[PDB]
Symmetry: C3
């Protein structure tokens, strides 16, 4: 039901492409696992974030400081996850094709 939204689609596709790319690369096994897991974690974390966003919104439209805060914190996690993935790919591919 949730898959049919422009934000999740654009997100799922990026990750999915990375997994596909990671499956084609001529890298050793552990590197391949690290390339795939890192981007999948992005998707996992984004899903939990959106889940939290849903709960907040479920409570209602009336703004509360802690409502904004839960979403910010959620967003921050997605950001750290993405940075983790960027760092992971950078280090492992530089090592490999550099």
């Amino acid at each position: 039901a949730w898959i049919n939204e422009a934000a999740f689609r654009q997100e799922g596709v990026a990750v999915l492409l990375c997994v596909v790319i990671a499956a084609w690369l001529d890298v050793d096994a552990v590197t391949r696992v690290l390339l795939i897991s890192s981007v999948m974690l992005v998707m996992i974390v984004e899903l939990l974030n959106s889940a939290i966003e849903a709960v907040v919104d479920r409570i209602g439209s009336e703004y509360h400081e802690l409502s904004g805060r839960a979403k910010d914190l959620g967003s921050a996690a997605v950001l750290i996850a993405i940075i983790d993935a960027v760092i992971t790919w950078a280090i492992l591919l530089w090592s490999h094709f550099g």
Copy 2:
């Protein structure tokens, strides 16, 4: 809890196999990740239920989203074990 059974076993098997430390860290973390995601999913369910037993579009949305996260974590785990065991026994 039978998740810890599945978990301990994965930890046992990973401990038993003659793999290097890096491989062993990945076999274990991939399983630990499923547990972290499940506990966070469960926490989100706890909150959805704390708000009300009554149905709401957004309450089900939250639960579907958390559940999809657990699934992706499980898939990540299966892929990790497949790839590493294939390579270990390659």
Copy 3:
């Protein structure tokens, strides 16, 4: 598309800033994580090992943030004791601890192999 990023980035900054400003323990964890990343970056190890040392402490930060987000929600609903509120927090806290243990182990194991 461009704005989704810009918006989310700004929320992310507010989240980090809020977590930092509100708890000493969060700041101290941030210091620990940053020291760990820096050490991992300045260490004579292969790339995969470097990535594991780094991603393991990052995960700690990720689960810390998600869990604090859940706490924010619980606290938002009511200050009153409620079984499901205590439970949400208990579960979330379990998650954070596992992430931390996984990290300590990951570093213990990998640093043993390299140095020992």
